[PDB]
Symmetry: D2
Subunit: 405 residues, 4 copies
C-alpha cells in the first residue's frame, strides 16, 4: 500500500519535463558534447554566453498550469555537468559564474509555489565535466552527493529528484543508501526517481511508453513503488532545430491516456532555447493537450487502472475513482449526416468485461450526451453505443462517465 | 505535352489552401450550417459580426512565401454561399454588407502579386444560401456563372479557379462549356481545377486522394494533358475547429508533400483562419516545420518529376528527375549516435533502385553535402547507395540525395 | 429484379470443385507450361501418346466433391493446350479417343456427377494454342469452338454449366457470343454460362468472376436489368495444374476463411485441385478436402442458403452475418481455445462480439458445432446484438465458428 | 565458451520430428484432454485396455523422419497422463506391457532410429496426473520419476537425449536436478539434456525458445558452458492428434519457421500426433512431403549452416548462413516468373542486399536449379547486392537459397 507521498505523486498524473543547459545554445540535442565528439574546452566556453536572457520561470509555471500538469521536472545539471544553481563553492561550472548570475533553480521553485506546482530536480549521475568520474569514482560520488545536498538545503521543500545515468556503470557500487539517506534526512517528503529495484528508498521507476500492461509495483509485502513514462515531441530532449520529426498531437494525447491506463504518471518534455524561452512549437502542443486535459480533469488525476477489459479489436479501457468509473474510448470518427458520410454515423457498440454493478446513466464528458448501454450483470458485460464526434470536434481519446445506481 | 500554363502549374509544387467564411466564427468546421442542422436565418446573421478585424493579406502571403508555397487558394464563397468579395449587386450576402466593408479578395490578389504568388479562387458550386439551387437549377447556374464573371473581370489576371460541388448532382448538366468558356474569354491563362474521363476539355487539373499510390493519369495520347493535385488539412476539418485536437504529425505532412511529387501532382496544405481572419498559432507551427524541409528540398521540389525507376523490395524510397540531375528521396532513416550510444542509424544502410543506367560521378545529401558511397550494375540498371543516418540533433523525415552524372 | 431460377439454384450450390487435368499434368510444372516454358509444339503434343488416364476414377472425383461439401464440379474439358478430354466426333484428332486412354472421360465424369447429385460444369478455353485456325482463320476458329461446345451440349445429357476462359487474349475481337451462347440456350436452356474476363460480355452470361479479395457485396446489375451472380476461385498453391515443386501452399485455415468470405460477399467459390498426369487426386489435395469437409459439414445449415444482409460487426472484428428465411447466422472469427483457470490458452474470458442491424427480439442463440447456448443482450431501438462468443473446447478449432439465431 | 562435442553434434542435427502418442490419441481431442476436459480418471485410464499399437511401425516412423530431412526423433515415452510406452520393469502397472500391445515400443523405436542413423530422444513429462505421489508425497514422486528415467538410461543402449517437460507446474519446488541429471550423465554421458521451462541446472545442454524469438539466441555467459537452443512447431493448435482442429498452418509457414530457427542458431522440432493405434495421419504426411522437398534442396546448408554477423537491407527478411566452405543467402518473398506477355510478379530485377560480406566472391547460384546470379560488391563497407531472380514457372520454394563461392 503506497506511502502518502507516493499516493500524492500518483494523483499528479501529468508533469512537464524541461531540458535546458549549455547544449541549448547549439540546438543539435542535449548529448551533443559526447556524440559530436566536441572539444571539451571549446564546448564549455558556452558558459560565457549563458545569459538566461529570456528565461521566465513564471511563464514555465504558467505553461504547466495551462496544460494540466501538476509538477515540473527541470534539468538542474545534465551530462554536460553544468549547474543551473549556486553550488556554493563546489564547482565553478555553474550559473553564478555565467553572465546570468542568477540562481535559476531559486526562480523556478518560487514560480512553482505561486502556481501550486511541485518542483522536481533532474540530476545527471553520469557526468562528462568532472575528471573524477573516470579516474576517482568514489570521490565523484561524494561530489554528486554534495551537489544534491545543496538542492536539499537551500530551496525549501522539494517535490522530488529525478536521477539519470547509473546505467553508464551497470555493475558499480553507487552508494545509493548514503545518497538517498541524505535526501531522506533533509527532504523526508521528496519523491526519488531513478531512470534505469535499485534501492529501498526509490519511490518511482521509469518505463518505456510502449509498455503494454499495468506496471509492476514491487515484490509482494515490500514497498510499493510507482511508475512514470516520458515522451518528447520530436526525437531529442534538448532543443534540436533541424529535427522535424515531430509526433502528432493525437499521439501525445493517446500516450498521456495510455500512461494512466497502465497506472503510471507521464512527463511531456520541452526543450528551451539557448536563452531559456519556450519555443513556439512546444506551445502548440501544450495548447492542444491542454484542451484535452481540461476535459479529462474529473478522471486524469484520481483515475486508476481496474481489472476491466475491452472487447476484441478495440483499444478502449477503463479508469476508476471512488465515486465513478470512466470509459476511455479510442478510434472514434466524426458524425456527418445521411448525405455527408464521415465515418461515425453508424451505431458503434463498444464492450467491456468486469463491470458488475447496475448503472443509472453514462455520459460523454465533452458535451454531456447521455449514452445508451446494455448490461449483463452475471457476466459483467457493459456495452455502450459510443457515438462519434459532433462535426467540428475530435478529442482523440473520448471519455464517458458512469454514474452507478 | 502540357500547355505552357499547365507546365507552369506543375512547377508551383506546393500551394496554401485558406478556409475562411462565416463558419469560422463558430469554430466547429466549414460544413456546420448543414451538418449541425442549423436554423438558416440564425446562421446567416453571422454576416453582422463578420468584421475581418485581424485579416492581413500580407501576412497570409508572407506565410506562403516562408513555407515554400508558390500559389494560394482562397475560399471566395463556400457552400454557406457568403461572398468574400464585392458581388456588384448580384447578392446582398457579401462582405460589402458586413461590417468588414472591404473587398477581401482585392486585398488578397494585391498581396499575392507583391510576393510573386499566383492567386487562386475557390468557388463552391453547391450552394446552401440561394433558394435557386433547389427550385430553379438553370437560374442557379446563371447566378453561379455571374459570381465567377465578377472574379474574372474586377481583379486583374488570376492564377486559377478551384471549383467544388458538381458532385452534389452527378447527373445534371452544369453547362461547363459556357462557364469555362467565359473564364477562357476574360482569363485565358487561368488554371481551371474541378474537384470531381475529364468532365470538360477546358479543365487543366484533376484532384486526387492523397493516398493515390501510383503516378497519376494525364489523359489519352492524342488528348489534352491534364495535371493533378492532392490536398491535406492539418486536423480533420478544413475550416477552423477548436475542439478538433486530432492533428497530424508534421512528419506525415512532409511525407505527403514528397509523395505528391512522387506521383507527379501538386499539393495544397490547408489552414483554417479564425472568425476575424487570423492565422491560428497551431498552423504557424506546421508552416515553420514544413518550411525548413521545403527550403532544403528546393533544388528538386519545384522542377522534379516522376521517372521509370523503382526502389528495392520493402522500401518506400523513390526518384525524381530534373534535366540536370536525379534525386533519391529516402525515408525511414534513423539518427546516428556512436558505438557506445546506439540510436539506430549507425550501420551501413544499402538502399537500391532499378532503372538508373548511366554512370554516376557523385551523390550527396542536400541537407549537409555529405558524399555517399554507391555501387552500380549498369547492365541491369541497379544503383545501390549507403544512405547514412541523420547526424545527431537533426531529422529531416524525407532525406534527399542529389546524383551528379558523369 | 429477382434472379432467374437457374441462377437462384446456382447461388444455392455455394461451393464447387475446380479440376485441372490435361496433357500439362504429365509434366507437373503448371498448366501454362507449353507457352511459358517456350516448348516446341511438336514435342509437347507428343504427350497425347502417353495419356493413359490409368488412375482416373470419376467416382473418386465425384466423391471428393461430395465429401468436401461441393455441389458442382468444373472440369477442364479442353485447356489452352487445346487437347480435348472427350470424343469430339470428328472435329479433331487431338482428343482422348486418339490417346491410349481411348475413353470419353467427360462421359464418365457426368455419369459420376449424376450418381452423386452434383452438377457437371465444363471448362472450355477459348484461347487455343493447338489449332492453326486460331492464328490463320479466326472466323473458322469460332466455328470450331462453337462446334466443340455443341458436342458437349448434345452428347452428355443435362449440363450444369459452361466456364469459358480466354476471350481476354483478343480484347477487341468479335467472339460471336450471341451465336455461341444462343446455341447453348437451344440445346441446354438451363445451363449456367460463366465467362472469365480480366458491363458483362453478353446478355446470356449468368455469372461473373471476381478476385478473392473483393471486400464488398458483389454487384448483380440494375433493377430493370438481368441479375448476374458471382464466383471467386482459390487454388491451394500458386498453380492450377499440378506443380510438384510448388511448395507455397495456403493454410487450410485461409481456405476456410476464403469460403466463408465468398458467402459474405454473395458469391460462390471454387476450390481448385490439379490431378496427376494419370488422373489421380494427389494426396496433398485430399488433406485440404478432408479439413474443409469437416468445416462445410458443420456449416451446412447456412453455407448453401445463407445470403448477405445489411448487418455489420463491431469495430475491430471480422465477424459477419448471413441470412436464411428461417434464421440468421453469426459467423465469428479469431476465437481461441478454452483451457481453464490454471491452463491458459487464450479463449477463457468473456468475449462480447457485437452486431448492428438486428431489429427483432431473439429467443435463443447456439453454436452449430456443439449446440452450446450463448448469452446475448439486445438494444432493439439501435439494433444492437451483443453475444458472449465462447472459445473453442480444448481439442477443436473451427477457424470460422457459426452461431444460429432463433427469433421469437 | 566452445560447445562440447555432443552439443556441436546436436546443432548439426538441425531438424527433428516430435511425435506425440499416448492414450490421449484414442480420443483425438488433444493431449491435455484428461485434465482440461475434467475427465473421470478411472474411465480415461481404461484406454490402456484398447492400446493395441496395431498400426505402429517404428521403421515407417523412422523412414518418414529420414524423408522429411530430420536427424532425430523426440518420442513421448510418458506424457502428463502418466502412461508409459515402455516396460517399466515393475515400477508401474500403467505401461505398455499391461496393455494388449504387450511390446516395448521404445525398444522398437530405438532400433528403428539406429538403422536410419537417427538419434532417438525420449520425451518425459515431469508433471504427472496418474501417480498419487505427485500431490501427496512429492519427494517420493521425484524418486519414481528418477527411476522411470533410470530404466530409459539402462535398457535401450545409447540414447541421443532426454526432453523433460513439466517443472513449470511447481516453479518454486526443489526438483533435485543434480541427482536426476547426474544419474543420466553416469549411464548416458553423451545424451543431450533438454528441459522445457517457459538454465535450470549446469547439466542442461539445450534451452527451448518461442518460435517468434527475433534475435540470435543466448548461449550462456562468455567463460561458462555453451548451451544450445531449440524451437518447436505443431501443425495445428494441438500436439496430440485433434480431429476437429482445422486450424492448420500453411506449409509455407512451416518452411519459413524451419529457416528462421537456423537463422537464430537453434534446432527446430516439427511435431506430429499419431492416431490412437500409432499411425501417422494423412494430414501429417502431406506436411512432411512438402517440407521434405524443401529440406532435400536445402541439405548443403540446413545441417552445417550457422548464424554470422551479416544483416539484410531495410524492409527485407533475407538472411545469411555460414559453413566453413560457403556462405548461403536465404531469400524470402520471391514471386514466380512468367513472360513478356504473362506477368506473374517475379520478372523485374530484384536487388537484395547484405551488410557484412568482406571477401571477394567468384560466383553465386540458386541451389534449386543452379542458375547463376549477378551481384555487385563494395568490399570496404562489406556490401553485397544480388539480383534475386524469381521462381521458374511451375515451382515456388518459399525460402530460396543461393550458394556463394568465394574467390
Amino acid at each position: 500500500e503506497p506511502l502518502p507521498r507516493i499516493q500524492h505523486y500518483e494523483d499528479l498524473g501529468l508533469g512537464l519535463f524541461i531540458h535546458w543547459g549549455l547544449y541549448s545554445q547549439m540546438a543539435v540535442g542535449e548529448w551533443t558534447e559526447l556524440i559530436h565528439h566536441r572539444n571539451q574546452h571549446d564546448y564549455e566556453q558556452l558558459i560565457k554566453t549563458f545569459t538566461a536572457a529570456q528565461f521566465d520561470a513564471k511563464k514555465i509555471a504558467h505553461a504547466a498550469k495551462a496544460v494540466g500538469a501538476k509538477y515540473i521536472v527541470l534539468t538542474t545539471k545534465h551530462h554536460e555537468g553544468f549547474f543551473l544553481y549556486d553550488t556554493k563553492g563546489l564547482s565553478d561550472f555553474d550559473v553564478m559564474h555565467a553572465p546570468a548570475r542568477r540562481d535559476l533553480i531559486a526562480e523556478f521553485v518560487a514560480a512553482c509555489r505561486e502556481e501550486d506546482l511541485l518542483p522536481f530536480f533532474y540530476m545527471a549521475t553520469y557526468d562528462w565535466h568532472t575528471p573524477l568520474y573516470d579516474d576517482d569514482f568514489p570521490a565523484y560520488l561524494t561530489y554528486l552527493q554534495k551537489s544534491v545536498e545543496v538542492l536539499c538545503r537551500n530551496y525549501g521543500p522539494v517535490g522530488g529528484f529525478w536521477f539519470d545515468g547509473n546505467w553508464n556503470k551497470k555493475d558499480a557500487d553507487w552508494h545509493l543508501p548514503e545518497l538517498y539517506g541524505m535526501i531522506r534526512h533533509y527532504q523526508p517528503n521528496a519523491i526519488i526517481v531513478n531512470n534505469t529495484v535499485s534501492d529501498p528508498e526509490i519511490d518511482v521507476v521509469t518505463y518505456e511508453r510502449r509498455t503494454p500492461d499495468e506496471i509492476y509495483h514491487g515484490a509482494p509485502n515490500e514497498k510499493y513503488v510507482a511508475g512514470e513514462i516520458s515522451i518528447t515531441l520530436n526525437q531529442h530532449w534538448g532543443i534540436a532545430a533541424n529535427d522535424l520529426n515531430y509526433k502528432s498531437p493525437a499521439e501525445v494525447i493517446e500516450t498521456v491516456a495510455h500512461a494512466r491506463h497502465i497506472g503510471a504518471n507521464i512527463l511531456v518534455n520541452i526543450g528551451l532555447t539557448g536563452t531559456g524561452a519556450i519555443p513556439a512549437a512546444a506551445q502548440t502542443y501544450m495548447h492542444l493537450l491542454g484542451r484535452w486535459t481540461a476535459m479529462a480533469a474529473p478522471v486524469l488525476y484520481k483515475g486508476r487502472p481496474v481489472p476491466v477489459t475491452s472487447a476484441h479489436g478495440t483499444r478502449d479501457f477503463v479508469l476508476h475513482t471512488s465515486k465513478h468509473d470512466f470509459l476511455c474510448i479510442l478510434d472514434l470518427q466524426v458524425v456527418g449526416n445521411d448525405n455527408v458520410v464521415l465515418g461515425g454515423e453508424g451505431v458503434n457498440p463498444r464492450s467491456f468485461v468486469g463491470i458488475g454493478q447496475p448503472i443509472q446513466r453514462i455520459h460523454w464528458l465533452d458535451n454531456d450526451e447521455v449514452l445508451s448501454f446494455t448490461q449483463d450483470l452475471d457476466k459483467k458485460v457493459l456495452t455502450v453505443d459510443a457515438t462519434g464526434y459532433p462535426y467540428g470536434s475530435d478529442w482523440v481519446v473520448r471519455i464517458a462517465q458512469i454514474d452507478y445506481e
